[model samples]
Target: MKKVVAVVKLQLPAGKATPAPPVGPALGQHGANIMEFVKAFNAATANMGDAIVPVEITIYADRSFTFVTKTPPASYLIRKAAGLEKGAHKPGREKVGRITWEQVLEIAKQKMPDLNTTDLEAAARMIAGSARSMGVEVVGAPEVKDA
Candidate 1:
């Protein structure tokens, strides 16, 4: 089986009403049914609701696929689980207590609709100010960069 990982945040194209990129043109070469895979994946991972998350798509040589969204980044689940309604002034440890993997898994399912929660990387970065605020080493992860 062939596999490809893509962040499903944008659904492969702009605009919601517009059709998704056809399975053929989008992933046929990769041997996948891009549409069906995305549909089912979206259904199963309803916890994400309409927001996008990291998805790992596996395709067969015959051009059929199944996709799954991965647990969001670790740091994200950390803060979300901590009950820190607001992100730290920084990414590492601006404010709050230590977080555990168990905590993250439990609350990871709780959806954060706005910039209020750091469940996703985009909101996480914005909330924490990342390396700048925390003075920690970062992968230079940035989301929805400001103008």
Candidate 2:
């Protein structure tokens, strides 16, 4: 829908006096109504503040926004699917696990903010490949071809 002006992917600074609200700093340089987005993002991030949380803030030219917090990196998803405490060592020698089409669809849905349907389709496969050092299958044509 809009351009990804910033990708705020950082952990909370330890021993901070207040809660680590990421949207504030992310939107600070864009001349937006900082406190509003801050509050909204705080509500979402507060519920999901553990490790390296990837937050994407899509900013339109009209100063509108769309926030999305991805569940985790491809590695984490693959590892969890594999039921392993860690990941593989070599480059292509490892296969993390398998995932269903619904999982790929979920990732595409969430990433639809910054990426269009075509990009989302490709990215889903890419992320799946990143999950396991193997090939990924992307099905169907994208709805938003130009977008």
Candidate 3:
């Protein structure tokens, strides 16, 4: 078994991994092969289109590394669905954009595996709340219960 030396987490744009600042300086300090990860990550995310992919990399003592990619952030997805460049400065007070419940369900399905819950309905609610917090209204969605 390979001994893990470092665990690096990053949110990079899909299909755009490069041997630059974040990737290079990050893995270089750990002695992991930066170019290798760049090539592999780019290839793996090639079909994902334009989206931020969060990855977890496990670097071994041998300088070899492996990474697992996760779905884009819910906020990113919400913004994209709403066609907004950014969220509102005052989330509750200012409405930046609006998204449909159906859109929320789609985002939830994509994030299902990464989310904590297994129930799809619960996942959808979580995503809807995320949208509301970003000042993106979720039309036709149930109200999120405060925890």
Candidate 4:
């Protein structure tokens, strides 16, 4: 069996990544080359500026490693759509903002590759749930009746 050295997961801000502290210690102690990860991470996320990006790193026994980056969390997207710095404290009784169905669809499309479902409607529903949790209402949805 191939030996594995270490595996780390982190949510880092785009273009601001550095081989410092957590990033350095996490791979440095594992005998993995640190700059490779830092430069790659920063380059990959450069377009996002300060957007938060989730990444996974796997180090092999040979000191070689690989990483994969995923889309930002649903909550982050919801907050961006609502233009809020954070979610509502009293989500049930208080409202933050609203997002249009079109924006939801755009988010869904961007997340489709990372989401479990290929069905757009299913992804939309999941996005809607996140928005609701953040106290962001969705406009352009027709009233639904129980069948």
Candidate that beats the other on TM-score, 2 or 4, i.e. the better one: 4
Error of 2 at 53 (Å): 8.9
- lDDT tens digits, residue span 1-147, model 3: 369877777677876556674657766776646666777777767644456766667778787787757455575466577877653454364546777878888888867664567777788777877666645567786558888
For each candidate, the alpha-carbon lDDT, in order, equals 0.43, 0.53, 0.68, 0.69
lDDT: which candidate is best? Answer: 4
Tell me the alpha-carbon RMSD of every candidate. Answer: 12.9, 11.5, 8.1, 7.4
- The TM-score, computed over Cα atoms with residue i paired to residue i, of candidate 3 is 0.50
Model 3 spans > 4 angstroms off: 1-32, 38-65, 86-95, 142-147
Clashes of 1: 1
Q: Tens digits of per-residue lDDT for model 2 on 5-31?
A: 455454432212143454456557677
Q: How would the candidate models be sorted by TM-score, starting from the highest?
A: 4, 3, 2, 1
Quick one: best TM-score, which candidate? 4
Candidate 1 lDDT over 1-147, as tens digits, reads 334343223343211312345344555455444455545665555444444453334544545455554344344454443445654464553545444433333444343533266554444453334323433333334456598
Better of 1 and 2 by lDDT: 2
Report how far off residue 1 is in candidate 1 (Å). 12
What C-alpha lDDT, on a 0 to 100 scale, does residue 113 get in candidate 2? Answer: 59
TM-score each candidate. 0.32, 0.34, 0.50, 0.52
- Candidates by lDDT, descending order: 4, 3, 2, 1
Please estimate how well model 1 matches the true structure, expressed as its whole-model Cα lDDT.
0.43
